[PDB]
Amino acid sequence: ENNHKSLLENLKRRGIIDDDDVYNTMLQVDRGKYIKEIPYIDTPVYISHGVTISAPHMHALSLKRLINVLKPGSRAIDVGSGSGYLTVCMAIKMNVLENKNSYVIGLERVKDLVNFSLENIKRDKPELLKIDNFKIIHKNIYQVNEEEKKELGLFDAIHVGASASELPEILVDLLAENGKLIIPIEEDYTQVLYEITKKNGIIKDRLFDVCFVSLKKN
């Protein structure tokens, strides 16, 4: 009897979702269109290539932290887009379909996962792969040179869905004034979810311990 909406209601009861905009966004994006196996259980679910689609509570929590910077008219990047679940959540919240100034990009290092996410989006919201301001790119974030770096511009919201040995400086440079970056960083014996903000040129905010797949440098 498991369904997407009842999943979201379970997260609310558990206080994982405490925001109407987090709820309404996720409600618009059915998890079962993004993973086939046990799509509504609150746990990560294996895809391929050593990677999982994150637990719904991890999507919910990250989306919560970014909720106010995911604004129509703004620019967001999902680093490690994976299943594309969270990337579509960003497209929805920012209304890339109606708002031409909204921009959402997913970067994914693994090509099979690029193709996996693009297939998910075709079946869910095929309108997203007809537009100029939504894309899923096959790319490692650590292989972004000066040229593409300049070309990407600045982002009001940066989500990184994989844990980094340390805070990659590119992500700091990709960040717009007042933008938020959500990222797990290995800090001694844990992965620590950080919220990083820019208020002239960075305030680091240690959130709590998390478990993410690794942000691979090659």
Ligand SMILES: Nc1ncnc2c1ncn2[C@@H]1O[C@H](CSCC[C@H](N)C(=O)O)[C@@H](O)[C@H]1O
């Ligand atoms: N250096 C890197 N650059 C871009 N993507 C990376 C990366 N290192 C790991 N990844 C990707 O990061 C993803 C993290 S797991 C997937 C998380 C995703 N938001 C989801 O819920 O589906 C994996 O798909 C992995 O392939």
